[PDB]
Enzyme design. Structure first.
Site, PDB file in Angstrom:
ATOM      1  N   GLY A  89       0.834  -1.203   0.000  1.00 42.72           N
ATOM      2  CA  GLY A  89       0.000   0.000   0.000  1.00 42.72           C
ATOM      3  C   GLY A  89       0.862   1.242   0.000  1.00 42.72           C
ATOM      4  N   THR A  90       0.236   2.395  -0.051  1.00 41.97           N
ATOM      5  CA  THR A  90       1.003   3.640   0.055  1.00 41.97           C
ATOM      6  C   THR A  90       1.818   3.698   1.342  1.00 41.97           C
ATOM      7  OG1 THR A  90      -0.597   4.860  -1.263  1.00 41.97           O
ATOM      8  CG2 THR A  90       0.807   6.131   0.249  1.00 41.97           C
ATOM      9  N   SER A 102      -3.622  -7.787  -2.325  1.00 41.08           N
ATOM     10  CA  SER A 102      -3.561  -7.278  -3.702  1.00 41.08           C
ATOM     11  C   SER A 102      -2.289  -7.768  -4.349  1.00 41.08           C
ATOM     12  CB  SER A 102      -3.549  -5.764  -3.763  1.00 41.08           C
ATOM     13  OG  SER A 102      -3.113  -5.298  -5.047  1.00 41.08           O
ATOM     14  N   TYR A 152      -0.950  -7.282  -7.473  1.00 37.64           N
ATOM     15  CA  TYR A 152      -0.090  -6.278  -8.066  1.00 37.64           C
ATOM     16  C   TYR A 152       0.726  -5.530  -6.990  1.00 37.64           C
ATOM     17  CZ  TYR A 152       2.054  -2.286 -10.142  1.00 37.64           C
ATOM     18  OH  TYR A 152       3.007  -1.366 -10.524  1.00 37.64           O
ATOM     19  N   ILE A 160      -5.686 -10.630   5.669  1.00 39.79           N
ATOM     20  CA  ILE A 160      -5.605 -10.786   7.122  1.00 39.79           C
ATOM     21  C   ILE A 160      -6.923 -11.282   7.736  1.00 39.79           C
ATOM     22  CG2 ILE A 160      -3.735  -9.123   7.380  1.00 39.79           C
ATOM     23  CD1 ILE A 160      -5.799  -7.052   8.339  1.00 39.79           C
ATOM     24  N   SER A 214      -3.257   4.845  11.937  1.00 38.92           N
ATOM     25  CA  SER A 214      -4.606   5.412  11.999  1.00 38.92           C
ATOM     26  C   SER A 214      -4.575   6.683  11.198  1.00 38.92           C
ATOM     27  CB  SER A 214      -5.045   5.717  13.435  1.00 38.92           C
ATOM     28  OG  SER A 214      -6.443   5.928  13.477  1.00 38.92           O
ATOM     29  N   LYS A 242      -8.949  11.202  10.134  1.00 36.93           N
ATOM     30  CA  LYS A 242     -10.378  11.018   9.876  1.00 36.93           C
ATOM     31  C   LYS A 242     -11.039  10.161  10.962  1.00 36.93           C
ATOM     32  CE  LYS A 242      -9.928  11.681   4.861  1.00 36.93           C
ATOM     33  NZ  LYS A 242      -9.095  12.887   5.119  1.00 36.93           N
ATOM     34  N   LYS A 272     -11.917   2.975  11.700  1.00 38.68           N
ATOM     35  CA  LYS A 272     -10.568   3.135  12.218  1.00 38.68           C
ATOM     36  C   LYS A 272     -10.551   3.549  13.693  1.00 38.68           C
ATOM     37  CE  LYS A 272      -7.149   2.713  10.337  1.00 38.68           C
ATOM     38  NZ  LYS A 272      -6.284   1.611   9.797  1.00 38.68           N
ATOM     39  N   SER A 305      -0.149  10.106  -2.623  1.00 42.14           N
ATOM     40  CA  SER A 305      -0.659   8.752  -2.601  1.00 42.14           C
ATOM     41  C   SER A 305      -1.629   8.487  -3.748  1.00 42.14           C
ATOM     42  CB  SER A 305      -1.254   8.360  -1.250  1.00 42.14           C
ATOM     43  OG  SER A 305      -2.264   9.216  -0.830  1.00 42.14           O
TER      44      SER A 305
HETATM   45  N1  LIG Z   1      -2.664   7.499   2.136  1.00 43.71           N
HETATM   46  C1  LIG Z   1      -2.840   8.488   3.012  1.00 43.71           C
HETATM   47  O1  LIG Z   1      -2.751   9.662   2.708  1.00 43.71           O
HETATM   48  C2  LIG Z   1      -3.109   8.187   4.456  1.00 43.71           C
HETATM   49  C3  LIG Z   1      -2.861   9.186   5.370  1.00 43.71           C
HETATM   50  C4  LIG Z   1      -3.073   8.944   6.709  1.00 43.71           C
HETATM   51  C5  LIG Z   1      -3.494   7.680   7.115  1.00 43.71           C
HETATM   52  N2  LIG Z   1      -3.681   6.709   6.197  1.00 43.71           N
HETATM   53  C6  LIG Z   1      -4.174   5.389   6.639  1.00 43.71           C
HETATM   54  O2  LIG Z   1      -3.256   4.336   6.379  1.00 43.71           O
HETATM   55  C7  LIG Z   1      -3.972   3.126   6.145  1.00 43.71           C
HETATM   56  C8  LIG Z   1      -3.429   2.498   4.870  1.00 43.71           C
HETATM   57  O3  LIG Z   1      -3.851   3.278   3.763  1.00 43.71           O
HETATM   58  P1  LIG Z   1      -3.016   3.509   2.400  1.00 43.71           P
HETATM   59  O4  LIG Z   1      -3.100   4.949   2.007  1.00 43.71           O
HETATM   60  O5  LIG Z   1      -1.684   2.839   2.532  1.00 43.71           O
HETATM   61  O6  LIG Z   1      -4.035   2.676   1.455  1.00 43.71           O
HETATM   62  P2  LIG Z   1      -3.589   1.634   0.323  1.00 43.71           P
HETATM   63  O7  LIG Z   1      -4.891   1.043  -0.188  1.00 43.71           O
HETATM   64  O8  LIG Z   1      -2.620   2.324  -0.584  1.00 43.71           O
HETATM   65  O9  LIG Z   1      -2.790   0.517   1.100  1.00 43.71           O
HETATM   66  C9  LIG Z   1      -3.452  -0.451   1.899  1.00 43.71           C
HETATM   67  C10 LIG Z   1      -2.847  -1.799   1.543  1.00 43.71           C
HETATM   68  O10 LIG Z   1      -3.469  -2.755   2.392  1.00 43.71           O
HETATM   69  C11 LIG Z   1      -3.839  -3.874   1.582  1.00 43.71           C
HETATM   70  N3  LIG Z   1      -4.963  -4.562   2.246  1.00 43.71           N
HETATM   71  C12 LIG Z   1      -6.184  -4.033   2.444  1.00 43.71           C
HETATM   72  N4  LIG Z   1      -6.952  -4.932   3.098  1.00 43.71           N
HETATM   73  C13 LIG Z   1      -6.225  -6.046   3.284  1.00 43.71           C
HETATM   74  C14 LIG Z   1      -6.487  -7.349   3.894  1.00 43.71           C
HETATM   75  N5  LIG Z   1      -7.711  -7.571   4.386  1.00 43.71           N
HETATM   76  N6  LIG Z   1      -5.490  -8.245   3.910  1.00 43.71           N
HETATM   77  C15 LIG Z   1      -4.281  -7.923   3.387  1.00 43.71           C
HETATM   78  N7  LIG Z   1      -3.964  -6.750   2.806  1.00 43.71           N
HETATM   79  C16 LIG Z   1      -4.904  -5.790   2.741  1.00 43.71           C
HETATM   80  C17 LIG Z   1      -4.143  -3.305   0.205  1.00 43.71           C
HETATM   81  O11 LIG Z   1      -4.046  -4.216  -0.883  1.00 43.71           O
HETATM   82  C18 LIG Z   1      -3.126  -2.187   0.073  1.00 43.71           C
HETATM   83  O12 LIG Z   1      -1.926  -2.608  -0.594  1.00 43.71           O
HETATM   84  C19 LIG Z   1      -5.471   3.461   6.135  1.00 43.71           C
HETATM   85  O13 LIG Z   1      -6.047   3.092   7.395  1.00 43.71           O
HETATM   86  C20 LIG Z   1      -5.466   4.965   5.940  1.00 43.71           C
HETATM   87  O14 LIG Z   1      -6.559   5.646   6.550  1.00 43.71           O
HETATM   88  C21 LIG Z   1      -3.505   6.946   4.899  1.00 43.71           C
HETATM   89  O1  LIG Z   2     -10.807  16.070  -7.479  1.00 45.22           O
HETATM   90  C1  LIG Z   2     -10.581  16.349  -6.273  1.00 45.22           C
HETATM   91  C2  LIG Z   2     -10.186  15.384  -5.339  1.00 45.22           C
HETATM   92  C3  LIG Z   2      -9.996  15.769  -4.014  1.00 45.22           C
HETATM   93  N1  LIG Z   2     -10.228  17.038  -3.638  1.00 45.22           N
HETATM   94  C4  LIG Z   2      -9.989  17.528  -2.274  1.00 45.22           C
HETATM   95  O2  LIG Z   2      -8.581  17.457  -1.968  1.00 45.22           O
HETATM   96  C5  LIG Z   2      -8.411  16.972  -0.629  1.00 45.22           C
HETATM   97  C6  LIG Z   2      -7.627  15.666  -0.628  1.00 45.22           C
HETATM   98  O3  LIG Z   2      -8.383  14.662  -1.293  1.00 45.22           O
HETATM   99  P1  LIG Z   2      -7.837  13.155  -1.336  1.00 45.22           P
HETATM  100  O4  LIG Z   2      -8.772  12.159  -1.913  1.00 45.22           O
HETATM  101  O5  LIG Z   2      -6.481  13.419  -1.925  1.00 45.22           O
HETATM  102  O6  LIG Z   2      -7.778  12.495   0.112  1.00 45.22           O
HETATM  103  P2  LIG Z   2      -8.868  12.276   1.280  1.00 45.22           P
HETATM  104  O7  LIG Z   2      -8.708  13.381   2.343  1.00 45.22           O
HETATM  105  O8  LIG Z   2     -10.008  12.343   0.307  1.00 45.22           O
HETATM  106  O9  LIG Z   2      -8.523  11.028   2.016  1.00 45.22           O
HETATM  107  C7  LIG Z   2      -9.809  16.825  -0.055  1.00 45.22           C
HETATM  108  O10 LIG Z   2     -10.209  18.023   0.631  1.00 45.22           O
HETATM  109  C8  LIG Z   2     -10.711  16.671  -1.267  1.00 45.22           C
HETATM  110  O11 LIG Z   2     -12.040  17.164  -1.108  1.00 45.22           O
HETATM  111  C9  LIG Z   2     -10.632  17.977  -4.599  1.00 45.22           C
HETATM  112  O12 LIG Z   2     -10.845  19.155  -4.287  1.00 45.22           O
HETATM  113  N2  LIG Z   2     -10.783  17.613  -5.879  1.00 45.22           N
END
Ligand SMILES: NC(=O)c1ccc[n+]([C@@H]2O[C@H](COP(=O)([O-])OP(=O)(O)OC[C@H]3O[C@@H](n4cnc5c(N)ncnc54)[C@H](O)[C@@H]3O)[C@@H](O)[C@H]2O)c1
Ligand SMILES: O=c1ccn([C@@H]2O[C@H](COP(=O)(O)OP(=O)(O)O)[C@@H](O)[C@H]2O)c(=O)[nH]1
Ligand SMILES: NC(=O)c1ccc[n+]([C@@H]2O[C@H](COP(=O)([O-])OP(=O)(O)OC[C@H]3O[C@@H](n4cnc5c(N)ncnc54)[C@H](O)[C@@H]3O)[C@@H](O)[C@H]2O)c1
Ligand SMILES: O=c1ccn([C@@H]2O[C@H](COP(=O)(O)OP(=O)(O)O)[C@@H](O)[C@H]2O)c(=O)[nH]1
Ligand code: NA
Ligand code: NA
Lengths: 337, 340
Positions: free
Chosen positions: A34-35, A58, A60, A83, A147, A150, A162, A190
């Site tokens: 994941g990211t 996933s 890929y 998981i 976490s 949100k 969450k 991301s």
């Molecule tokens: N990306 C962001 O900007 C961001 C910021 C703050 C917090 N987070 C949090 O981090 C967490 C991860 O998000 P992300 O951005 O990495 O999303 P993502 O979808 O890029 O990564 C999540 C990964 O987990 C895997 N996954 C999901 N469910 C699974 C399962 N049941 N078994 C095994 N693998 C599984 C997916 O295939 C994916 O590769 C989320 O809870 C999200 O809220 C993300």
């Molecule tokens: O086409 C878009 C997509 C997202 N956003 C805004 O940009 C911020 C970040 O969106 P993103 O999906 O990147 O992450 P999220 O906070 O949605 O997890 C949020 O305020 C969205 O409402 C936007 O204005 N236009």
């Protein structure tokens, strides 16, 4: 570059501390492709983990992170697995006996989770329960869950799930099994986040789609957030809810406008707030949060809940008709939009 | 580009046939956000499906196809679900009552499936049983499964699981529930495939990794392969194992050379890395000289015999519990020759 312009550049990144935490450990990362997970993996290697076990459902994403880390292939095991499969997961833990679990698997897209609330419950809450329960049974020393901002006074299903994950994991913390959760906000760039979307729209000579003139988010580079997560995990004694200082809020309109100016003409179109979407996410640092030795890391207050109660609620969440209403009973600050 | 050079350009694409098959249908695509699935979704829209139900367990992939199709948002429903979850899946089918299922959810990477053979069994064989069983119980009229040339005289776990999937689905076919499987080879530009691998290696000034100087694959553009799949589905009467004509095979060495030439960057050397476990030098040519013709020159029907499902369900249970999945697969698929 826009990412540069919005990077936090925390003054308190501490390589040698994370190395001290990670050197020669067996570490398992869930959502490894994941990211967040991919960056956790990259840093585990960087800071000297002995064996990295990569769990992702996933193919890929597992492929990609495995291939990215090809120079260290002798230290990594790609495990293609949900998981939610308790029995297979228990086997993975028995076999490899990881000392640390970094839990980055979840569903996070607010709109798709409003449309699929039962799947958000299962994947997030039940998945976290199964992984956390199996970690504790198999004597994993420490467990760190990713976490999100949100999760604070949640207005969407995703965020509320969450929050339930925080309550569960932190309530499982004890002297033998040290749990920490880390809240942080948006990660720059991301996949399927606002920035690459705008970059695309700009490259396709399309108008930029802006949700609301006033919407703001907090941002960090992925490497910044992940290193701080790991510093937080290093200092945890079990039971901590950590929060990252994200710096200044960023107005998404200003982000649109900077990106336009950066590519030297298109119009910005306002498209409207989405269900459960917040105009401003909650600021993560409360004035009564405890400081740590890191200026970017604070400890927020949390109480344990009764696990017999919370397990029954989790059972009920799996079968109930109104998931929203069930979540409110568990998370009283949930104001579902 | 290379894509253009290796595109099949099949002479027998039939838009009006596909429209006739799909117009105003409720269609559910499994693996809707995947390489093949996402193109299936796009073509369901193109050819006039009334409602497309998009099922996928990968949140980003589901997100992306849903967004790709936002101009048709009122006709699509993004269902974030693993097809292993029978009870949620049964409810999806009860709610939306699709008339057609296009089954494009699987694990396909040969090395990962060698390292995770049990997950390959569960996701592929067990996921296909559940989806197929639920489709049949819920009176879905037609079920089309995406298969692969790796299912033919398989030498790997992945390919062997897909062969088992063919056996199961085809043996489920009857006069109420029409099943078609369609085998084809490599899709140009696919998720995690050799061409993006080579593009990223050039982008970072690294040598190209070529498994073997003689290795060949058959190729087709994703839109070609998928429209031909849908044309097969359209003519199927249940029980057919279809195979596509992929044209001339391509030596991967020539492809690597061409891509180096095409970005002027013949400074880069081509390092030979070695044939992987389970990997074939040459995938099987899909059309047998005794396959039956159809009205489409690019589509033939290969022979298949139903097996007994009581036997096949028993073996499927054994796969989930057995000590040695390779050995258990061989019992189900006599022609399985596992390469280590
Ligand atoms: N990306 C962001 O900007 C961001 C910021 C703050 C917090 N987070 C949090 O981090 C967490 C991860 O998000 P992300 O951005 O990495 O999303 P993502 O979808 O890029 O990564 C999540 C990964 O987990 C895997 N996954 C999901 N469910 C699974 C399962 N049941 N078994 C095994 N693998 C599984 C997916 O295939 C994916 O590769 C989320 O809870 C999200 O809220 C993300
Ligand atoms: O086409 C878009 C997509 C997202 N956003 C805004 O940009 C911020 C970040 O969106 P993103 O999906 O990147 O992450 P999220 O906070 O949605 O997890 C949020 O305020 C969205 O409402 C936007 O204005 N236009
Ligand atoms: N790409 C090719 O070149 C090619 C060629 C011929 C045949 N095929 C076959 O097509 C099938 C899919 O291939 P692809 O290239 O689309 O792979 P992909 O991984 O790009 O697409 C598969 C999709 O199915 C989803 N998925 C997997 N398991 C699932 C589950 N249990 N529930 C819900 N969704 C699930 C994945 O998340 C993904 O979006 C495979 O069986 C493969 O062998 C692929
Ligand atoms: O880094 C690579 C990846 C693949 N291949 C070869 O290119 C062909 C296409 O492989 P791909 O993974 O794209 O799909 P597969 O045929 O493995 O399903 C196969 O013969 C591979 O052995 C290669 O030479 N170098
Ligand atoms: Na230091
Ligand atoms: Na490895």
């Amino acid at each position: 570059s826009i990412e540069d312009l919005l990077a936090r550049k925390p003054k308190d990144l501490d390589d040698s501390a994370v190395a001290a935490f990670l050197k020669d450990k067996v570490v398992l990362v869930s959502g490894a492709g994941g990211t967040i997970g991919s960056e956790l993996c990259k840093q585990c290697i960087k800071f000297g983990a002995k064996h990295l076990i990569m769990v992702d459902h996933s193919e890929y994403n597992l492929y990609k992170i495995n291939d990215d880390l090809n120079l260290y292939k002798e230290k990594i095991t790609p495990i293609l697995l949900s998981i939610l499969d308790k029995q297979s997961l228990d086997e993975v833990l028995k076999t490899y006996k990881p000392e640390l679990i970094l839990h980055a698997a979840a569903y996070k897209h607010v709109p798709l989770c409003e449309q699929n609330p039962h799947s958000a419950v299962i994947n997030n809450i039940l998945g976290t329960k199964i992984l956390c329960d199996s970690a504790k049974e198999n004597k994993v020393a420490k467990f760190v869950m990713i976490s999100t901002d949100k999760a604070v006074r949640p207005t969407n299903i995703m965020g509320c799930t969450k929050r339930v994950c925080e309550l569960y994991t932190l309530s499982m913390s004890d002297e033998n099994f040290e749990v920490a959760c880390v809240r942080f906000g948006n990660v720059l760039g991301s996949s399927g986040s606002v920035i690459p979307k705008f970059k695309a729209q700009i490259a396709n000579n399309e108008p930029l789609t802006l949700t609301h003139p006033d919407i703001v988010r907090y941002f960090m580079l992925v490497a910044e957030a992940v290193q701080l997560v790991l510093q937080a995990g290093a200092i945890a004694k079990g039971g901590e809810l950590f929060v990252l200082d994200m710096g200044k809020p960023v107005k998404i309109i200003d982000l649109a406008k900077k990106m336009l100016l950066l590519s030297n003409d298109l119009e910005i179109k306002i498209t409207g707030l989405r269900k459960g979407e917040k105009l401003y996410e909650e600021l993560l640092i409360d004035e009564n949060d405890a400081k740590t030795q890191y200026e970017s890391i604070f400890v927020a207050k949390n109480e344990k809940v009764d696990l017999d109660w919370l397990n029954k609620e989790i059972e009920n969440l799996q079968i109930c008709e109104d998931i929203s209403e069930a979540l409110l009973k568990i998370v009283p600050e949930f104001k579902h939009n």
